[PDB]
Design a binder for this molecule. Structure first.
Ligand SMILES: [Zn+2]
Length: 192
């Protein structure tokens, strides 16, 4: 939560904040965007938005969500949650997340990551699977999703208007991380 005024971040800052890239040494704190869309047999729907802050020692940005953002959900409505981040949830972050999907059906939780993290640990594999086995939705944060999160979850200068256009690689990077996220879901037999 830690809400205040707006539910997005100013480009002037995000530019030096979201810059946290593998090809860049020096990180401060990453923000996790969440979008929940509920519905009642067609008619009234409640849409929520905002970023969460990871706790140095307690609840990771991911948890902070269900901690205040989505505390409870009605089995009579269709909740549509969406997470837009760059770093994948740790074996613990994806935990409290799977425990929610294994109980809530009408609730559709979604999470994207432009880059896979700790996707080589024997603990994260079994911690990320449950998500795919519980009903969670995992997808490599495509270069097309950013735009929205850049024009919505991010405030643009006044009068001006830009657009995050990754001229470096749209697929090359996707396919790369794509095999990573899936890998955990697909493990080879031990015959060595
Ligand atoms: Zn975490």
């Amino acid at each position: 939560g830690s809400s205040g005024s707006s539910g997005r971040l100013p480009v002037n800052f995000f530019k030096f904040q979201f810059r946290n890239v593998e090809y860049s040494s020096g990180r401060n704190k990453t923000f996790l965007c969440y979008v929940v869309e509920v519905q009642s047999k067609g008619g009234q729907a409640q849409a929520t938005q905002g970023y969460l802050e990871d706790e140095h020692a307690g609840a990771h940005a991911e948890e902070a969500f269900f901690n205040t953002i989505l505390p409870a959900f009605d089995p009579a409505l269709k909740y549509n949650v969406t997470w837009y981040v760059s770093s994948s949830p740790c074996a613990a972050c994806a935990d409290r997340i799977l425990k929610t999907l294994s109980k809530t059906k009408n609730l559709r939780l979604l999470i994207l990551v432009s880059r896979l993290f700790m996707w080589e640990e024997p603990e994260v594999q079994a911690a990320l699977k449950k998500l795919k086995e519980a009903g969670c939705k995992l997808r490599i944060m495509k270069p097309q999703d950013f735009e929205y999160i850049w024009q919505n979850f991010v405030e643009q200068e006044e009068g001006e208007s830009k657009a995050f256009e990754p001229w470096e690689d749209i697929q090359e990077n996707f396919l790369y991380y794509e095999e990573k996220l899936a890998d955990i879901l697909k493990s080879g037999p031990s015959s060595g």
